């Protein structure tokens, strides 16, 4: 049988834990060629992208290493 109704005197507090993205750090340190570009024309067989900034005279570099890449005035 049950005689008494008793509660425990020690009160516990639930620790609220949560994972938030509070820090925003990134290691931006690469080894690559970066160009001044007055025009870039990316021709792969699916998608062609033509981006043109105007000038009086241009030059042409062409890269066929992965996909056709045409650069105007380097």
């Amino acid at each position: 049988m049950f005689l008494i109704h008793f509660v425990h005197y020690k009160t516990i507090l639930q620790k609220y834990t949560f994972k938030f993205k509070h820090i925003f750090l990134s290691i931006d340190k690469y080894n690559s060629l970066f160009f001044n570009i007055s025009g870039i024309l990316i021709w792969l067989n699916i998608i062609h992208i033509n981006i043109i900034l105007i000038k009086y005279s241009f030059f042409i570099l062409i890269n066929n290493f992965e996909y056709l890449i045409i650069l105007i005035s380097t």
């Binding site: 060629l33 001044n36 042409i60 570099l61 062409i62 066929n64 290493f65």
Partner: protein, 320 residues
């Protein structure tokens, strides 16, 4: 070789391969510098009324060759594939010939071609101190520039590891540094040209002087950007790594395709047979002897004749 991740370290086949290849050592011995013993002198290969070709064979333990074109009129010299374990004979040769080094041509940026490039530029600029030397190269070799350190890792070239390559410095094709207002030895290199893959017989040349024109030809397969030199007035074809004596270049390295090498061999059939082909490795030959006696070209044209749409030719054991 490659980066040792978790899967490569827990593999027993990796330790089995490193036992089979190198015995009980397990580490590959690198490619060392040629000492001052067993080193030969610079030979004058060709003399002409226009140009002079001066070369040295087996200047690396990669068994590569070092060549320089000299313009007889303008007194300007041009190194092609600058990779010599001792670039002190060449600077003394240039200084005793009263020559000016203005550019260095690079076929491709493998380690057998650009290992001593900073040494060439530093010693020749130091002799010029008593306008700097430019570099002519193809930007696809950018992908082989960034792995210059890793290739210096595997072949034991530790003193050339921590060296910023001159092709990585800021040229006129790049944005400029915004320095504090209160230097130009390394900040900007105005003498730098980037070769284009659209190579033609009309305008894809370098004016070497005295009416001598050097046509660079875009010919991949051993590299994503691989530029031969062609001098039609002198019948001289600096092939680099595309064609050698009785053999062609490797395809079993990264960024190397066999069908690109086959197209590069197919774009060479319009030159005459008396064109002396000058390879990056080994002995020199002629293009007619390679049309008659080279089995790789025979296999390429035989596969083309029997109907292969994607003809893939290439070596798996040879020169890097």
């Amino acid at each position: 070789s490659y980066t040792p991740n978790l899967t490569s370290l827990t593999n027993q086949v990796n330790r089995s391969e490193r036992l089979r290849k190198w015995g009980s050592a397990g580490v590959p011995p690198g490619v060392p510098r040629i000492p001052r013993l067993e080193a030969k002198g610079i030979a004058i290969l060709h003399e002409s009324p226009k140009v002079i070709l001066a070369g040295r064979s087996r200047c690396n333990n990669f068994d590569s060759n070092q060549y320089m074109l000299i313009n007889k009129a303008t007194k300007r010299c041009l190194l092609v594939d600058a990779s010599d374990d001792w670039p002190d004979d060449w600077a003394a040769f240039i200084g005793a010939s009263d020559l000016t080094l203005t550019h260095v041509f690079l076929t491709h940026c493998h380690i057998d071609n650009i290992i001593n490039l900073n040494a060439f530029l530093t010693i020749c600029g130091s002799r010029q101190k008593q306008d700097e030397i430019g570099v002519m190269w193809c930007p696809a070799e950018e992908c082989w520039v960034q792995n210059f350190k890793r290739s210096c890792e595997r072949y034991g070239r530790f003193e050339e590891m921590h060296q910023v390559l001159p092709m990585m410095c800021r040229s006129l094709y790049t944005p400029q540094h915004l320095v504090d207002p209160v230097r130009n030895a390394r900040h900007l290199r105005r003498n730098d040209v980037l070769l284009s893959a659209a190579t033609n017989r009309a305008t894809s040349f370098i004016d070497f002087g005295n009416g001598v024109l050097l046509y660079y030809i875009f010919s991949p397969g051993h590299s994503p950007g691989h530029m031969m030199l062609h001098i039609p007035t002198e019948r001289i074809l600096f092939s680099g790594d595309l064609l050698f004596f009785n053999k062609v270049g490797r395809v079993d390295l990264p960024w190397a395709t066999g069908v690109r090498l086959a197209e590069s061999l197919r774009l060479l059939e319009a030159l005459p047979d008396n064109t002396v082909v000058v390879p990056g490795h080994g002995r020199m030959t002629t293009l007619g002897r390679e049309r008659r006696e080279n089995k790789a070209l025979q296999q390429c044209y035989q596969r083309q004749e029997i109907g292969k749409q994607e003809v893939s030719v290439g070596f798996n054991e040879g020169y890097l």
